[PDB]
């Protein structure tokens, strides 16, 4: 049911504000030095999201 | 199990409602709030739909028709259902293979007017002479030949896409004609018999829209 | 009521009333919290759909 | 045989606009050597420059001289009839030609008849093996 | 809000003819084709600047 | 078929003023090779002396000639009822005007129409990849 | 015979407006190649700014060129006369006027004459299975 | 290759009004065999008696037919954007004009578009060797 | 032999505008004795008095007569479709042809085919050892 011009399932509707419509951009390397505490697995190549995965 | 009408009083409004008081075009679909409404039956309001959504996605997937009322609320006045999907029991196939080509009512309609029609068109080629050893036709006679018959029949199809058809994928494919001395082993062939063979798609029209909504803020 | 169980139920609520796994009903909610400052600021978990009313 | 160019059929229906009278796929001959011409590509390209062009709707047509059928109207092979025409060669091309109005005819001595006919679509088919769809 | 107006404006395409692969449209059929659909929603979306909308 | 110049489909959606009447969106053609026109800047520039110009608001305006269609009154494609229209061309461009007026009708013979339109916007769709916001 | 553009019959009617004498629905023929014209919307929009227009009276108008009849004086296809007129066309259309005027006639050679007619309304008959209540 | 006429180079740049966008000097061509036209004294002399003139300011305007291109907005080329125009060409002569003001568009099919533009001044740069300070 | 005037290979590709289907490179003979004819300058000067000449840009155009492939539609040969056309005589010289628009066909009797291509440019290479850059 829900409400009447969403009822029917005619038009499904997701809203979402972190959403991106770009396609994928070719691609950078970064290459550095890490820490102790780091978790990621050294000398293996990783892909990045986004600034905030960083310093764990 | 908790429907709160005389089941047979929706199925009769149903029946009645796609029978005749709409199908007079083979093409429309009896779904919606406007087209699907059974505006005969009335029902108290509730809070409590009767199938759960994933219940109703386990009937429309598995060859069932489902409905629900018009509008909701908990003050129990009446309200009229209407169908969500107009679709037959049809799954699988006649060699087991799983496929939407009887998916909805539509199509059984639609293939019982395309079978009148192409019965109506080939009555022209009855009690006509037929030239299949030699196929020159001498000058003043009244007949026709394989080809010619053939490329009236593909004619008669070109002629059809968008009231009954859908365009053919490769029509050379799609159409064939052949005569039964062709087919049936030497001294065996009947005069004036011809096998055909047809392959068409009904027309498409539309059936959801995905939206994906993205607020943001104004910046820069 | 001021109990922060109750409140996460009723923000799971609307939670669900806004997933797109099926049609919508949308809504917002209203709730209040009362205390200290480093104990109001300690119910924040991030709910759009809630509006917190502090008070002292 | 197979590279014998030439006419092998010719069938025409007529359909009395007044009336509504009709007469059967009657089969017909030529007069001479011309062979009938065709345009099967309803739409037509102008110049312009820098090689674009404007494209706009146009018509398909037909030229078919045939020789009359002493059994019907002079006037019936004139504007005063509707066609339905079918040409068969003898490599296996065949052009359906349904629903075809003549225009502006010319004079004719009672035996020999040249058509200009125009539709909306004219079928072609060819012999088995083609290649477009 | 402009949820339910956009369901409601995209009702008009439910049952709608659509052609896609050859999109040219027999002459005295009632439908429409991916480009048409497109203009009409900008179209939408624009006269809403004002009512629903900030400038895109 | 990248240059081509043309029209490639025509919708029209009619609503009667009168009694509110919808007509749903026909697929129409054209009577001849001249292709509509547009006018998509709402404002008016006139010239005054030393290059300034004086600016006023004007409409935008669209100048549609189609066949009409046989299962829609006449008096409909003239002032008497509503008009949303759009346009599609070869090359990608899609111009789109809802809620038209139609101005100052002439005589038609019955089949050909030639509408001239105003609205408050237009509506212009360019091929993938343009340059402006 | 379908997609035929032309005029099958015309029928006027002839009503003196000083003495009431009146001549029945004779049957009329055209000088040329030129199809009668009509206006059936009784409605005028003048364009004002921002897409809004003006709406006045006006009338329904048709424009009649016919071969004069032998028989009927010359001053009654002029301003002399009451007309009521009828127009069918090859697709199936009628065109029915009645109670006309004939406004600012023109100067005749005796067997060509193009009248000018305006009525309150124009009814139109379209063919079977129209679209429009 | 001295004594050819016509046009060698158009380079056009846009400035939008309402938003200030700019896009750079994109090169143009021609629909057809029409050059633009030029009139670069400022003032104008009306016709005393007696040898006399009267001199007012007037302005100075320039004709530009081009081909639209399909990256910019048709209402672009129309009113509703500022427009900086140079125009080279065979002999040598450059035609510099800028801050130009688009008056009175007519209507336009798409793809070709003959601006008139008026500006305060326009520079004409000769082929070397002139004999005017 | 140096001195033999002729044509040695026609290659041709379709592609079809309304839905992409393509078709290789397939080789073609020609009906008679005429030749292709060219015109590879995409300018044209007409006379003026005293010596000079207005240039004004144009197509490339090429004739190019063939018999049809009976594995392609006649339409196709017509304007229903994009082409894509190479010829080398026996000298050496080779002309290339791409995106070409065949404007304003004839009728053809099923056989032979005569078509007129424009395009924006024609390649030409001459034999080993050219002067011009």
Not at chain 2, 108 to 113: K, S, T, V
Not at chain 2, 114 to 134: C, E, I, P, R, S
Not at chain 3, 14 to 29: L, M, N
Request: some cysteine; glycine content about 8%; charged content about 20%.
């Amino acid at each position: 049911m829900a409400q009447d011009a969403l009822s029917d399932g005619f038009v499904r509707l997701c809203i979402d504000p972190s959403l991106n419509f770009f396609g994928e951009g070719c691609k950078i390397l970064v290459e550095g030095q890490i820490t102790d505490d780091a978790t990621a697995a050294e000398n293996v190549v990783t892909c990045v999201n986004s600034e905030l995965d960083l310093v764990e | 199990t908790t429907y709160p009408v005389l089941p047979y009083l929706t199925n009769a409004a149903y029946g009645a409602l796609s029978a005749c008081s709409t199908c007079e075009n083979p093409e429309l679909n009896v779904q919606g709030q406007t087209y699907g409404l059974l505006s005969c039956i009335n029902m108290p309001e509730s809070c409590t739909p009767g199938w759960e959504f994933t219940e109703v996605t386990q009937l429309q997937n598995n060859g069932f028709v489902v409905s629900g009322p018009a509008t909701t609320s908990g003050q129990g006045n009446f309200t009229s259902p209407y169908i969500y999907n107009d679709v037959t029991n049809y799954l699988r196939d006649e060699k087991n293979r799983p496929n939407a080509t009887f998916r909805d009512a539509s199509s059984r309609r639609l293939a019982a007017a395309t079978g009148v029609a192409l019965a109506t068109f080939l009555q022209q080629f009855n009690g006509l002479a037929v030239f299949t050893k030699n196929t020159n036709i001498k000058t003043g006679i009244i007949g026709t030949n394989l080809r010619l018959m053939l490329g009236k029949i593909r004619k008669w199809a070109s002629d059809n896409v968008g009231v009954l058809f859908s365009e053919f994928d490769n029509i050379n494919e799609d159409i064939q004609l052949v005569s039964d001395f062709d087919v049936q082993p030497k001294c065996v062939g009947q005069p004036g018999v011809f096998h055909l063979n047809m392959r068409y798609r009904p027309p498409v029209r539309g059936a959801r829209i995905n939206v994906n909504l993205v607020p943001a803020l104004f910046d820069n | 009521s001021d109990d922060t169980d109750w409140q996460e139920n009723l923000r799971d609520w609307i939670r669900s009333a806004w997933d797109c796994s099926k049609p919508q009903c949308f809504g917002h909610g209203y709730v209040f919290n009362k205390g200290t400052l480093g104990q109001v600021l300690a119910d924040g978990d991030n709910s759009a759909e809630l509006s917190r009313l502090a008070l002292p | 045989c197979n590279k014998q160019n030439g006419v092998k059929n010719i069938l025409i229906t007529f359909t009395h606009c007044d009336t509504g009278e009709v007469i059967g796929p009657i089969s017909h001959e030529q007069p001479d050597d011309t062979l009938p011409t065709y345009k099967t590509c309803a739409w037509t390209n102008t110049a312009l420059t820098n090689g674009a062009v404007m494209r706009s709707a146009s018509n398909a047509t037909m030229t078919l001289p045939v020789v009359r059928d002493p059994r019907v109207p002079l006037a019936w092979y004139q504007g005063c009839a509707q066609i339905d025409a079918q040409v068969e060669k003898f490599d296996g091309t065949v052009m359906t030609l349904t629903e075809g109005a003549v225009t502006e005819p010319e004079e004719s001595d009672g035996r020999a008849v040249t058509m200009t006919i125009i539709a909306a679509e004219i079928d072609e088919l060819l012999p088995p093996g083609s290649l477009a769809a």
